[PDB]
Amino acid sequence: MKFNKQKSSSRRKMRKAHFTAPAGLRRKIMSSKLSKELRLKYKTRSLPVRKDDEVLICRGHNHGREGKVVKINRKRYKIYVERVTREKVNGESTFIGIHPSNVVLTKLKVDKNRKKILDRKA
Amino acid sequence: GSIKRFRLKQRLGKCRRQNRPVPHWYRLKKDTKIRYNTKRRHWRRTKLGL
Amino acid sequence: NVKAYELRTLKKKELLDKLDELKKELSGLRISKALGNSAKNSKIHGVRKNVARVLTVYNQ
Amino acid sequence: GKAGKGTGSFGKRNGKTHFLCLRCGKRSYHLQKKKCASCGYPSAKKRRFNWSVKAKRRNTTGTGRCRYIKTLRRKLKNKFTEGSTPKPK
RNA sequence: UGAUGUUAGGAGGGCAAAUCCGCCGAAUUUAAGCAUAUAAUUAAGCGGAAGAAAAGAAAAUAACUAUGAUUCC
RNA sequence: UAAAGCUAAAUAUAUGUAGGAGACCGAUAGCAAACAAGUACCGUGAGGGAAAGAUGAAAUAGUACUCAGGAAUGAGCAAU
RNA sequence: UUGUGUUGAAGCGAAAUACGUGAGUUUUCGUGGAACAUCUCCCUAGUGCAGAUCUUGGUGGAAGUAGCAACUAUUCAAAUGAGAACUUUGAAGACUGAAGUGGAGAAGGGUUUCUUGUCAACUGUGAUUGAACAAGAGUUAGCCGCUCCUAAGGGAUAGCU
RNA sequence: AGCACAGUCUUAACGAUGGAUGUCUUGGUUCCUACAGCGAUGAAGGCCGCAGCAAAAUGCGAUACGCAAUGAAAAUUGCAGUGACUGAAUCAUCAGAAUGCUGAAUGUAAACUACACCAAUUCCCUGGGAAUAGUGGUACUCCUACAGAAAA
Ligand SMILES: [Mg+2]
Ligand SMILES: [Mg+2]
Ligand SMILES: [Mg+2]
Ligand SMILES: [Mg+2]
Ligand SMILES: [Mg+2]
Ligand SMILES: [Mg+2]
Ligand SMILES: [Mg+2]
Ligand SMILES: [Mg+2]
Ligand SMILES: [Mg+2]
Ligand SMILES: [Mg+2]
Ligand SMILES: [Mg+2]
Ligand SMILES: [Mg+2]
Ligand SMILES: [Mg+2]
Ligand SMILES: [Mg+2]
Ligand SMILES: [Mg+2]
Ligand SMILES: [Mg+2]
Ligand SMILES: [Mg+2]
Ligand SMILES: [Mg+2]
Ligand SMILES: [Mg+2]
Ligand SMILES: [Mg+2]
Ligand SMILES: [Mg+2]
Ligand SMILES: [Mg+2]
Ligand SMILES: [Mg+2]
Ligand SMILES: [Mg+2]
Ligand SMILES: [Mg+2]
Ligand SMILES: [Mg+2]
Ligand SMILES: [Mg+2]
Ligand SMILES: [Mg+2]
Ligand SMILES: [Mg+2]
Ligand SMILES: [Mg+2]
Ligand SMILES: [Mg+2]
Ligand SMILES: [Mg+2]
Ligand SMILES: [Mg+2]
Ligand SMILES: [Mg+2]
Ligand SMILES: [Mg+2]
Ligand SMILES: [Mg+2]
Ligand SMILES: [Mg+2]
Ligand SMILES: [Mg+2]
Ligand SMILES: [Mg+2]
Ligand SMILES: [Zn+2]
């Protein structure tokens, strides 16, 4: 690392650890940034992205569009938004994969689990 | 021949079972590359060596 | 779909009875699969797991 | 003559010297001596020599299932008392 | 005193060897040839242990104004 | 002060397991093996033993439609 | 130390009113799609190929050439099919000649057996055939055998080395 | 509508065949540090099985690509299916339960799923009931104790 010699800074090792991470670690890696308004109401800076949140697309060809998150794909490292779509060569409709770090989430969907986390973070 | 022992007959059946192709639905899977079974054996070409 | 914590209060008698009827049901499903009735082929897994849970509780 | 020392006498080659070996599964059991040429089956030991490094590594400890040994790792760091469980709830 | 006992309670046997302990035991090679010599108290073979093993509290040096169990640099 | 016995530390570690690193190699190189590799295959047997990595940011974009042809396949005013 | 690059790197193909005695250096156009130098002075090495009956891989002339010759022998008409000298049906002419390409077993093989489908490669000419490829089936014993007895022999126990 | 002899060799431009070059790397290699055996309470190795549709490799053992418990915690997905709306879908940890036939292999054997002797054996309720040809033991050498017999 920087000063403690007990963990690595090898490209090989922790580039192998990113692509074979277990499914319980993949949700911490898949985290987004909180808006300015949500950063006063909550003392956290960033949260892992969940399903029924609302996000603003900030980077890419679809920058500036908003909408709701309809699916999370932990194997491919991607999320899906409700009206951002594509046509295949057949003519069937699909969803364009978005990377969660390209996004900032503007409205949350709280529950029993979330509260006991935001409370600790504040 | 026609005369056999139990163990040998069971091994013959086992060897016959493993000489079948990769299923078709398995190929529609993602995160897979296995096209065909690379250990196929024809009775007249390669001997079992039992 | 049975749960382990709901079986810790049963007596050995009806624990064995429950295992017996689980086995009868799984045999029925196997028979119906041998005939080309594919409709209920997906229920086998749940019955198998239920049998395993009942055996676990009884043996402990 | 006609069953000479080459092609003609290869047609007389039915019969078997060796068959499958109980305790190692290789076709190396001399049916008439009754002794495996690979593992030395009828005897208690294993029949491995030091002049073959390659042979000594096809059938060593690491190259199988390790059924009971693999479950015995990390007890050196957990060191739980036998008969114990984590606290409930 | 020995045999006997499906009497009660227990032990040994097989795997693995990089480092360790005991036995057995060559020739290639060098000598510009070769037989003593060297290779070597080595390779192959057969046995026995531990996280280290083996050694170890003088029937030891010295010849000095004397030192003081073993191991290793 | 022989012909009986025990005993830590400072030493070693081409094995097994875990961790860290380099003026080292870069798919005919580096372990035989970067891939269902001691695998496929050869020998009665003791044994011998390979070849084979790369579309694209995204196939949650892997080629829809039309014409010719028995089909493969080709062509387009048509398509990612 | 001080520089190039999505306003296009390395590499590769063809070149130049270019420089040098020379090994080479530099530049244009095309392709390409992601990295590349340092000549300011130093350090370092698995550092320079025409050959070794050199190693591994790819490719020629010979060349549409050598050749596709044992086992007496084929013909007419029909069905199928995109397509029949070598698939099927009927009619002819012939062979094996009971020491038979007729029946039944052992060693060895292991599903080659049966029904259906069927042609990318194979079936050294064709092929709609097939022991090839795919889906599903098929082996029933008190009386047939093993299993029991002993043989030439093998392994062991006591003891001894 | 018409005109270039054919073959062989040389140069350019566009292609075919082949896989060199450059760039890439979840691999190798060496050194440094730390810990260290397993087995009759049945090891290492071998064989046979287990999924709804399932060949290999990977994982498991008649509870068989996984049970219970503990920490996280909504989905897993090729179809079919199962999931709170947190002992449940999935990931991690792993202490309880369970762990086929073998193998030193140890009742006699072994290119046999061959053949013995001894105790019938297991389960449910609190003395009654029920089930099953199913279960366990029996190598060799040795030590301590014991048992009687036999010899002196
Ligand atoms: Mg036979
Ligand atoms: Mg043959
Ligand atoms: Mg000879
Ligand atoms: Mg013989
Ligand atoms: Mg013994
Ligand atoms: Mg021993
Ligand atoms: Mg000499
Ligand atoms: Mg000389
Ligand atoms: Mg000489
Ligand atoms: Mg030695
Ligand atoms: Mg030991
Ligand atoms: Mg000691
Ligand atoms: Mg001592
Ligand atoms: Mg002493
Ligand atoms: Mg490294
Ligand atoms: Mg290589
Ligand atoms: Mg350069
Ligand atoms: Mg060189
Ligand atoms: Mg060269
Ligand atoms: Mg050359
Ligand atoms: Mg040639
Ligand atoms: Mg000719
Ligand atoms: Mg023919
Ligand atoms: Mg005649
Ligand atoms: Mg005649
Ligand atoms: Mg005659
Ligand atoms: Mg047939
Ligand atoms: Mg047919
Ligand atoms: Mg042909
Ligand atoms: Mg076939
Ligand atoms: Mg029968
Ligand atoms: Mg009979
Ligand atoms: Mg005899
Ligand atoms: Mg001309
Ligand atoms: Mg609870
Ligand atoms: Mg839980
Ligand atoms: Mg067991
Ligand atoms: Mg036995
Ligand atoms: Mg017999
Ligand atoms: Zn063997």
mmCIF file of C-alpha atoms in Angstrom, chain C:
data_model
loop_
_atom_site.group_PDB
_atom_site.id
_atom_site.type_symbol
_atom_site.label_atom_id
_atom_site.label_comp_id
_atom_site.label_asym_id
_atom_site.label_seq_id
_atom_site.Cartn_x
_atom_site.Cartn_y
_atom_site.Cartn_z
ATOM 1 C CA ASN C 1 -41.028 -25.440 1.874
ATOM 2 C CA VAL C 2 -40.399 -26.228 5.549
ATOM 3 C CA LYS C 3 -38.072 -24.456 7.963
ATOM 4 C CA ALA C 4 -35.670 -25.962 10.476
ATOM 5 C CA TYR C 5 -36.801 -23.768 13.370
ATOM 6 C CA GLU C 6 -40.432 -24.819 12.938
ATOM 7 C CA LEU C 7 -39.426 -28.484 13.356
ATOM 8 C CA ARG C 8 -37.453 -28.184 16.616
ATOM 9 C CA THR C 9 -40.666 -28.543 18.651
ATOM 10 C CA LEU C 10 -42.058 -31.654 16.979
ATOM 11 C CA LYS C 11 -41.718 -35.070 18.570
ATOM 12 C CA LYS C 12 -39.769 -37.900 16.920
ATOM 13 C CA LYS C 13 -43.028 -39.709 16.085
ATOM 14 C CA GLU C 14 -44.533 -37.093 13.791
ATOM 15 C CA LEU C 15 -41.085 -36.128 12.514
ATOM 16 C CA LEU C 16 -40.809 -39.663 11.121
ATOM 17 C CA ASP C 17 -44.384 -39.441 9.829
ATOM 18 C CA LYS C 18 -43.582 -36.218 7.966
ATOM 19 C CA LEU C 19 -40.501 -37.804 6.410
ATOM 20 C CA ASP C 20 -42.609 -40.754 5.224
ATOM 21 C CA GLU C 21 -45.145 -38.597 3.427
ATOM 22 C CA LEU C 22 -42.396 -36.450 1.882
ATOM 23 C CA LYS C 23 -40.913 -39.635 0.438
ATOM 24 C CA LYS C 24 -44.286 -40.764 -0.942
ATOM 25 C CA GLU C 25 -44.729 -37.395 -2.655
ATOM 26 C CA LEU C 26 -41.271 -37.442 -4.220
ATOM 27 C CA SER C 27 -41.870 -40.970 -5.533
ATOM 28 C CA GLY C 28 -45.095 -39.761 -7.131
ATOM 29 C CA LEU C 29 -43.261 -36.931 -8.880
ATOM 30 C CA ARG C 30 -40.569 -39.316 -10.143
ATOM 31 C CA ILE C 31 -43.206 -41.690 -11.535
ATOM 32 C CA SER C 32 -44.994 -38.831 -13.275
ATOM 33 C CA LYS C 33 -41.684 -37.714 -14.786
ATOM 34 C CA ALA C 34 -40.977 -41.178 -16.211
ATOM 35 C CA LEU C 35 -44.155 -40.652 -18.197
ATOM 36 C CA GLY C 36 -43.704 -37.600 -20.376
ATOM 37 C CA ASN C 37 -45.638 -35.305 -18.017
ATOM 38 C CA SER C 38 -43.091 -32.502 -17.733
ATOM 39 C CA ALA C 39 -45.349 -29.974 -15.985
ATOM 40 C CA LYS C 40 -44.235 -30.599 -12.381
ATOM 41 C CA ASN C 41 -40.595 -31.509 -13.057
ATOM 42 C CA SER C 42 -39.415 -28.381 -11.213
ATOM 43 C CA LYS C 43 -40.929 -29.294 -7.824
ATOM 44 C CA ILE C 44 -38.467 -32.149 -7.207
ATOM 45 C CA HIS C 45 -35.739 -29.855 -5.852
ATOM 46 C CA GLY C 46 -37.900 -28.421 -3.069
ATOM 47 C CA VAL C 47 -39.068 -31.834 -1.870
ATOM 48 C CA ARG C 48 -35.459 -33.045 -1.826
ATOM 49 C CA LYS C 49 -34.364 -30.120 0.337
ATOM 50 C CA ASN C 50 -37.294 -30.644 2.712
ATOM 51 C CA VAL C 51 -36.267 -34.278 3.185
ATOM 52 C CA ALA C 52 -32.721 -33.166 3.987
ATOM 53 C CA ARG C 53 -33.899 -30.665 6.614
ATOM 54 C CA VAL C 54 -36.128 -33.212 8.356
ATOM 55 C CA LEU C 55 -33.271 -35.713 8.542
ATOM 56 C CA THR C 56 -30.954 -33.051 9.969
ATOM 57 C CA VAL C 57 -33.336 -32.212 12.819
ATOM 58 C CA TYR C 58 -34.055 -35.852 13.647
ATOM 59 C CA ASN C 59 -30.392 -36.859 13.763
ATOM 60 C CA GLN C 60 -29.391 -33.915 15.950
#
